């Protein structure tokens, strides 16, 4: 057991080995204090299902490490491969890349997995 967030200081090439350790803790659980538990738990479940639906639209459902066909734009980032994976933490990389969230998702949804599904149906047409 490497511990929840226990890799937060590690390089991405090391931290990316702990994904199951962390993902298993994204989902757990005369007075109105029972509304704290219910309103917290329903929001926690709602956030988890938004992540799983979002991975399913991209085509990654049921994977943790997932690979997709969208190529990089040097405007999003342009540093060397080891200067990512062997050199910095996910928490640091997030604060470099955080502009191009939404842009990358809009490019994944239609302009990858919808089109993979158009072509799959036109193949299984036979």
């Amino acid at each position: 057991f490497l511990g929840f967030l226990g890799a937060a200081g590690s390089t991405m090439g090391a931290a990316s080995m702990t994904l199951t350790v962390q993902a298993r803790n994204l989902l757990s659980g005369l007075t109105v204090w029972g509304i704290k538990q219910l309103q917290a738990r329903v929001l926690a479940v709602e956030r988890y299902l938004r992540d799983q639906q979002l991975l399913g639209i991209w085509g990654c459902s049921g994977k943790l490490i997932c690979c997709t066909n969208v190529p990089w734009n040097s405007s999003w980032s342009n540093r060397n491969l080891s200067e990512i994976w062997d050199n910095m933490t996910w928490l640091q990389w997030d604060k470099e890349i955080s502009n191009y969230t939404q842009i990358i998702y809009g490019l994944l949804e239609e302009s990858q997995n919808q089109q993979e599904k158009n072509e799959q149906d036109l193949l299984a047409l036979d």
């Binding site: 931290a15 990316s16 994904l19 962390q22 994204l26 309103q39 990654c60 994977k63 943790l64 190529p71």
Partner: peptide, 19 residues
């Protein structure tokens, strides 16, 4: 060439208010 790859359960956080 480099490609968009996706990770779930990544160690990262934002500061926020909660119960």
């Amino acid at each position: 060439n480099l490609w968009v790859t996706v990770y779930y359960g990544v160690p990262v956080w934002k500061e926020a208010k909660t119960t």
